[PDB]
Copies of this chain bind each other. A is one copy, B any other.
């Protein structure tokens, strides 16, 4: 309780399965946290093989051993394909190499096949002692390591197939890969009507394929769990040509690998290619990404996620009793959870069976939840339509308020579309609240948002300015254009501006409409949401340049980098980028520091720069402190490290945050942009009374947000007391729970 918890304990880690970027982070974590907890940590080179083999394939991990591992893609402990471990003629000898080295806790990072082989290894572990007792080693060992086999399944597979885990390691980075490709395929097709047919990964799991389609506006997709029952080819080519008139350049048909048809006679990305060339005769071009989806460098998220589980695993190992079942650490709602291994397995296999028989409804369901939504939403945003137009339709407006963010356009896109798909009218507002005000309001036709999903910045224009000081003009406009509901995509001043709207209801009867704030800020400072749109993008930005700055044309080795992140008062970035990059320190506001500490953070990095570490990272929140500025931290770090090392200072500042959204932000921005519009339509129906809408309840004025396992509408006003208005941040930020983890990873 602690440091004393894993004293007299040892653990071996092992990286089975295919390479999934961020496995390396998991490892690191596991190691660093293992050691930390007084335990000893052993590597196991080459997956289950080094377990089976032993000897030179089981080497002890040091702290210095896992250094510079966060930012490396694939697995460095090694991943093999041992099929000796799938039979008992090899599990025994692995069990031998385990009790021979004296081990009770095993960490297996892998996918569905690697987490099931350790599952059966826990269950068939009782008898492997009595069998490896006929001549194995002394029976004084089996009476000292009995029903004490602890194994934690850390899910690692670029499939996202494993069920029981919201995310798997790598799945984000893989998405990035796919995305960069499409991001370079989509931005060149200017000549002929090029129709790329990109076949992605996915053995049985349509995830990547769908997510990618929902992040690139794929013209059509094929996924395993819901194959295209019946005559579709006419549909697809009726739709590729339906898409050609409407005036379109390129088409992106995404193909899951496990692509199958109604019956099961699999769809082939070439056969597709053929169909469209033979049917429509466009200049088709098949690409099979393949094993480069496992490449590159892990995304911020995957470096974060993998530190999290790798801490969770360690925890779960050392908190393992004879009576405790087999353990699979995995995210859910944004919280670390220990999930029973066997159920996780037994169920992550039910889907395969449910899909083997023609019951694809059951397959869709067993995957279900979000997956089912993405599907629905994608299609619905993938349409060619839209419907026919009524007059008793409510008319919605959508706007951008605050600092721009990656995903603003993606939201916008989904809001309108979804909007229009209800048969409602969608108005669009240029330049935030200066929008209803001046009157720069247009009507949005299905096309208006065409292919925005990927575009970064703000296509409508976003301004920070607030509604109150001009309530007259805006109320006047809500009536003139007949606005009936607001959807506000943006940062703190959307929430703020929202709260401002509530007050307007007292003095004006027009603003008595409902509104939804969708959080879109780089800073992730908006109350009542764990995340915000544009965060991941900014964070991936910072994290990248942090790694590219971890080089510099130095006249010599030994050098320290102090880097000031952005984000006003919110340490999110700093903290997150600080962890994703593995900074010795991330100074943030919410965690105030005294020089007394500041000193000891240095009288420390120096002691490492004097040894193991050759490059040093100090992150600094742009406002974490008024006096201990960039220049103070810097200079301090400099002097103390005179002779010992060199040191440069880098202020990233706000390096054009209008670049291009990462998949996540696109999805996030698309999902919400549907989720709200839907809600909104329901709130406008319930406040229609007598030929006039009247939303005067607190329920009609909300910020949609991420809160644990579910998205949630929370009224602005209910959030007042949850938010610090001086620093424009929320009270209680979930990720402060990570600060320590960032700290022990630095060895504190």
Interface residues of A, Cβ cutoff 8 Å to B: 595-596, 599, 625-629, 631-632, 635-636, 638-640, 642
Contact = CB atoms under 8 A, between A and B. Distances in A.
B625 A629 contact: no
A626 B639 contact: yes
A635 B629 contact: yes
A720 B309 CA distance: 67
Contacts of A625: 639
A636 B639 CA distance: 15
Contacts of A628: 635, 639
16 contacts: A595-B595, A595-B599, A595-B639, A599-B599, A625-B639, A626-B638, A627-B635, A627-B636, A627-B639, A628-B635, A629-B635, A631-B631, A631-B632, A631-B635, A632-B635, A632-B636
A629 B639 CA distance: 10
Contacts of A626: 638-639
Given A595-B595, A631-B635, 17 more contacts: A595-B599, A595-B639, A595-B640, A599-B599, A625-B639, A626-B638, A626-B639, A627-B635, A627-B636, A627-B639, A627-B642, A628-B635, A628-B639, A631-B631, A631-B632, A632-B632, A632-B635
A703 B215 CA distance: 81
A625 B599 CA distance: 17
A655 B642 CA distance: 33
A121 to B, nearest CB: 54
Contacts of A639: 595, 625-628
Contacts of A638: 626-627
Contacts of A636: 595, 627, 632
Copies in the complex: 2
Contacts of A627: 635-636, 638-639, 642
Nearest to A593: B639
Contacts of A599: 595-596, 599
A595 B596 CA distance: 10
Nearest to A639: B627
A640 B595 CA distance: 8
A637 to B, nearest CB: 9
Nearest to A631: B631
Nearest to A628: B639
Contacts of A635: 627-629, 631-632
A42 to B, nearest CB: 40
A144 B595 CA distance: 53
Nearest to A635: B627
A640 B640 CA distance: 20
A616 B301 CA distance: 50
Nearest to A627: B639
Which of A596, A635, A642 lies at the interface centre, i.e. has the most chain B CB atoms within 10 A of its CB?
A635
Give the most central of A596, A599, A627, A636: most B CB within 10 Å. Answer: A627
Which of A628, A638, A639 has the most chain B CB within a 10 Å cutoff? Answer: A639
CB-CB nearest 6 A-B residue pairs = A627-B639, A627-B635, A627-B638, A632-B635, A632-B632, A628-B639
A599 B594 CA distance: 11
A629 B635 CA distance: 8
A627 B639 CA distance: 5
Contacts of A629: 635
A458 B279 CA distance: 97
Contacts of A642: 627
A639 B628 CA distance: 7
A14 to B, nearest CB: 45
A439 to B, nearest CB: 46
A631 B634 CA distance: 12
A391 to B, nearest CB: 63
A642 B625 CA distance: 12
A599 B602 CA distance: 14
A635 B629 CA distance: 8
A632 B640 CA distance: 13
A626 to B, nearest CB: 7
Nearest to A632: B635
A628 B635 CA distance: 7
A606 to B, nearest CB: 12
Nearest to A598: B595
A595 to B, nearest CB: 6
A639 B596 CA distance: 12
Nearest to A638: B627
Contacts of A640: 595
A488 to B, nearest CB: 37
A635 B625 CA distance: 11
Q: Which of A632, A636, A642 neighbours the largest number of chain B CB atoms within 10 Å of its CB?
A: A632
A642 B594 CA distance: 12
A627 B640 CA distance: 9
Contacts of A631: 631-632, 635
A91 to B, nearest CB: 58
A638 B629 CA distance: 12
A640 B626 CA distance: 11
Nearest to A637: B627
A72 to B, nearest CB: 34
A396 B596 CA distance: 62
A631 B629 CA distance: 10
A621 to B, nearest CB: 15
A644 to B, nearest CB: 13
A638 B642 CA distance: 25
A730 to B, nearest CB: 25
A635 B635 CA distance: 12
